Amino acid sequence: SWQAYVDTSLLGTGKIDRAAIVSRAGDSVWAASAGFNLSPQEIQGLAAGFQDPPSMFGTGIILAGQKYITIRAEGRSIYGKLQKEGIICVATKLCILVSHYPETTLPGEAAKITEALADYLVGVGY
Ligand code: NA
Numbered sequence: 330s331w332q333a334y335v336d337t338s339l340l341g342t343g344k345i346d347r348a349a350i351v352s353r354a355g356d357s358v359w360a361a362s363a364g365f366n367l368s369p370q371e372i373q374g375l376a377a378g379f380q381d382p383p384s385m386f387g388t389g390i391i392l393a394g395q396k397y398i399t400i401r402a403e404g405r406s407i408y409g410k411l412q413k414e415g416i417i418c419v420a421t422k423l424c425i426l427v428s429h430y431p432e433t434t435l436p437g438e439a440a441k442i443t444e445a446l447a448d449y450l451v452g453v454g455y
């Protein structure tokens with residue numbers, strides 16, 4: 330299940346405290362961890378971000394009612410920071426992985442893990 334990816338593969342690392350998997354077109358949430366609610370406006374904006382990544386620097390990244398400073402924005406990867414916390418968003422063929430990381434994990438760790446789950450999903454065809 331997509332929930333199994335959120336629970337086991339992302340949250341189960343101990344380095345990502347909140348996660349979601351959303352359609353790549355930004356029309357729905359396929360799976361999300363408890364209390365991490367991404368509005369239709371937020372996922373549509375993020376999806377639009379992958380189609381015009383330089384624009385994400387001006388707007389920042391708004392997810393679950395919180396704005397993050399845009400640190401990386403490219404075709405498949407959009408990263409944000411909020412002090413020592415942040416989010417990693419990676420587009421696969423069919424989905425977008427969203428990973429929030431807390432104070433105690435390095436951005437590099439969180440990026441590495443969700444980039445990896447992304448390539449895996451691309452390899453499988455999703
Ligand atoms: Na900003």
Ligand code: NA
Pocket residue numbers: 406
């Ligand atoms: Na990258």
Ligand code: NA
Pocket residue numbers: 437440441444
């Ligand atoms: Na990396």
